[PDB]
Paper text:
Previous studies indicated that the small protein LpdD (lp_0272) is associated with the UbiD-type gallate decarboxylase LpdC (lp_2945) in Lactobacillus plantarum. The crystal structure of the purified LpdD reveals a dimeric protein with structural similarity to the eukaryotic heterodimeric proteasome assembly chaperone Pba3/4. Solution studies demonstrate that LpdD protein specifically binds to reduced prFMN species only. The addition of the LpdD–prFMNH2 complex supports reconstitution and activation of the purified E. coli apo-UbiD in vitro, leading to modest 3,4-dihydroxybenzoic acid decarboxylation. These observations suggest that LpdD acts as a prFMNH2-binding chaperone, enabling apo-UbiD activation through enhanced prFMNH2 incorporation and subsequent oxidative maturation.
Given both H35 and H61 are strictly conserved, we made LpdD H35A and H61A variants to test for the effect of an intact metal-binding site on prFMNH2 binding. The H61A variant crystallized in the same space group and conditions as the WT LpdD, and superposed with the Mn2+-bound WT LpdD monomer (0.24 Å rmsd). The loop region spanning residues 55 to 62 was disordered for both monomers in the AU. Residual electron density was present located next to H35 and D63 that was assigned to a weakly bound Mn2+. When tested using whole-cell decarboxylation assays, both variants displayed reduced activity when compared with WT LpdD whole-cell assays, with H35A more affected than H61A. In vitro reconstitution of the purified H61A variant reveals this mutation does not abolish prFMNH2 binding, whereas the purified H35A variant did not bind prFMNH2 under the conditions used. This suggests that His35—and by extension metal binding—is more important for LpdD function in vivo compared with H61, although neither are essential under the conditions tested. While mutagenesis of either H35 or H61 affects metal binding and, in the case of H35, prFMNH2 binding in vitro, both variants retain residual activity when assayed in E. coli whole-cell context.
Author numbering:
A (entry chain A): -1 to 55, 62 to 121
B (entry chain B): -1 to 55, 64 to 121
The structure:
Amino acid sequence: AAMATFTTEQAGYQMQAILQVIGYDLLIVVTGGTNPHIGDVTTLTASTVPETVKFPSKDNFISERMAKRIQRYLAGSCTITAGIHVNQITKAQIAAAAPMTDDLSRQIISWLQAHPV
Amino acid sequence: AAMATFTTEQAGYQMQAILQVIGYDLLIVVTGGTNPHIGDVTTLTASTVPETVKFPSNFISERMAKRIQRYLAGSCTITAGIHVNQITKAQIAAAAPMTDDLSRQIISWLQAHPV
Ligand SMILES: [Mn+2]
């Protein structure tokens, strides 16, 4: 109804998006790999450029990529947290972050289309 | 071979996509109606997030880019500008299916003529 979980796994590790709808607004928690955390927070609306806070620890490539993918479908505000970490991550797994972020975005968008906010 | 033209017509007005291949890259020009123009431009590769520019007084170039993004071997630049004088609501509603129709046409051609 107002909450949903999306997963994807490529190159041998999983990333996950937990979506929460509050009124007309979105909260999306993106984690993955061995040690999930909150490394970056991206805020936006459909009309505004996304801003990112980076906490002390490039997780924002994920939170901002997702934001750009879904910006056109936002009925209100959107907050996206990202914290993916893979131990001894490989170049392949690093390359898989963008396709995986796109995959979660497409599930999210398709969810929003089935569940108009 | 390096250029192709696709058309569609629904609700009594036509849209056309002219495709040009330059190296591995694509230029696609979408026009339609009585007054073709360039009102929005979408750029993308298979692996970047498409970016749309809107010129002042944008769904078509953006919508086509998302349709075809996975089939791209290089860069893609899609211009779009359709205009119908006294456009009707059903003609508005027809722009999306016509965009999809051109997209399926374009995907078919790309697979038959692998860049
Ligand atoms: Mn981090």
